[PDB]
Amino acid sequence: MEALVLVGHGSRLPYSKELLVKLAEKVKERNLFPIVEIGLMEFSEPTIPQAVKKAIEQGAKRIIVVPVFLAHGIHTTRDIPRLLGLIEEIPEDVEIIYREPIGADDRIVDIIIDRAFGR
Amino acid sequence: MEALVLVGHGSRLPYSKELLVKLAEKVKERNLFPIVEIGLMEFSEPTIPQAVKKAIEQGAKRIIVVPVFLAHGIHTTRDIPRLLGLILEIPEDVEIIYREPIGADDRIVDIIIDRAFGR
Ligand SMILES: O=C(O)CCC1=C(CC(=O)O)c2cc3[nH]c(cc4nc(cc5[nH]c(cc1n2)c(CC(=O)O)c5CCC(=O)O)C(CC(=O)O)=C4CCC(=O)O)c(CC(=O)O)c3CCC(=O)O
């Protein structure tokens, strides 16, 4: 009844999409959401509008959109809200819930320290 | 004897730099590294060359550079290695060690799920 849509920047390179694809696989393995889709802001498919429609077509009435971005920027603040139609795509009486980016989470510091030590 | 340098993209907005600043502060509280510095690839100061010199000036002989990026891209594969001189003035008794980005870590999935639930 609710869907999770992970949105990413996109790249002319393949690494950004591979990340979102792997992230969606790992989330699916956790069996929390009925529907899970990814969309990429630029350069690649699925686009963000296509992911929201796939979710709607599978029968989701609440679409949770999580920006897989570390920090806020023009994408997360302007460009993406606009694609979702949240700022001046047909949301069919469904609710889109636009979540927060990753930010300076304690678990990021944990990751950073591992990377520093080659782990 | 060794320094940790966190490098980030930079932004015409203030959100990207604040993240790196909060991240540096959190790492410093862990007391693992003698010297901790941040550098921004574009738009903002400190720049990446400035951070490596600040580190050198305090007396670091090994400079661990961690890309605070989720995925590989042209910045992490070309532009940043270039600034580090890996592909300005680097003393010979000093080595730069360029680490990996965050990637599709389990701890990221954990973060994504919290964000999905508005936590
Ligand atoms: O003109 C060129 O192409 C050369 C420069 C260029 C390319 C690089 C290249 O292709 O050489 C580059 C590529 C990418 N940029 C990255 C990130 C973002 N760049 C920042 C700002 C924008 N940069 C744009 C252009 C450049 N975009 C524009 C114009 C536009 O996107 O519309 C602006 C927006 C300005 C506006 O519209 O007013 C922002 C926004 C912000 O931070 O606010 C961030 C995103 C958050 C962040 O990570 O900072 C990422 C993701 C990453 O790297 O993490 C990619 C893809 C991965 C990769 O690089 O493989």
Q: Is B73 annotated as a binding residue?
A: yes
The angle at the Cα of A62, spanning B108 to A98, to the nearest 5 degrees, equals 50
Q: Which helix (H) or strand (E) holds B65?
A: strand B62-67
Options A8, A9, A55, A64, the catalytic residue = A9
CA angle A3, B108, A70 (to 5 degrees): 90
Rounded Cα distance, A14 and B49, in Å: 28
Burial class (CB in 10 A: 0-12, 13-18, 19+), B81: middle
DSSP lists the bridge partners of residue A64 as A4, A97
Minimum-distance CB partner of B105 among A100, A109, A111 = A111
DSSP for B11-43, please give it.
Answer: -SSSHHHHHHHHHHHHHHHT---SEEEEEESSS
Residue nearest to atom 42 of ligand 1 (CA): B11
Q: How was this structure determined?
A: X-ray
User: Tokens representing B2?
Assistant: 């060794």
- Amino acid A98 reads Y
Q: What is the DSSP letter of B47?
A: B
CA angle B60, B66, B67 (to 5 degrees): 140
Residues on chain A touching B22 (C-beta within 8 angstroms): 104
Residue A41, phi-psi category: left (phi > 0), alpha (psi -120 to 50), beta (remainder): alpha
Resolution stated for this PDB structure, in Å: 3.1
Q: How far is B33 from chain A (nearest CA, A)?
A: 10
Say how far apart CA B20 and CA B66 lie, in whole Å: 11
Antiparallel, parallel or unpaired: β A62-67 and A95-98: parallel
Interhelix angle for A106-116 vs B106-116, to 10°?
170
Measured between CB atoms, does B62 come within 8 Å of chain A? no
B115 touches chain A (CB under 8 A): yes
Q: Which residues contact A12 (CB under 8 A, 6 or more apart)?
A: A43, B74
| Angstrom distance (rounded) from CA B22 to CA B9 | 15
- DSSP per residue, A44-112: SSSBHHHHHHHHHHTT-SEEEEEE--SS--HIIIIIHHHHTTS------S-EEEE-----S-HHHHHHH
Partner residue facing B73 (CB), from A11, A99, A110: A11
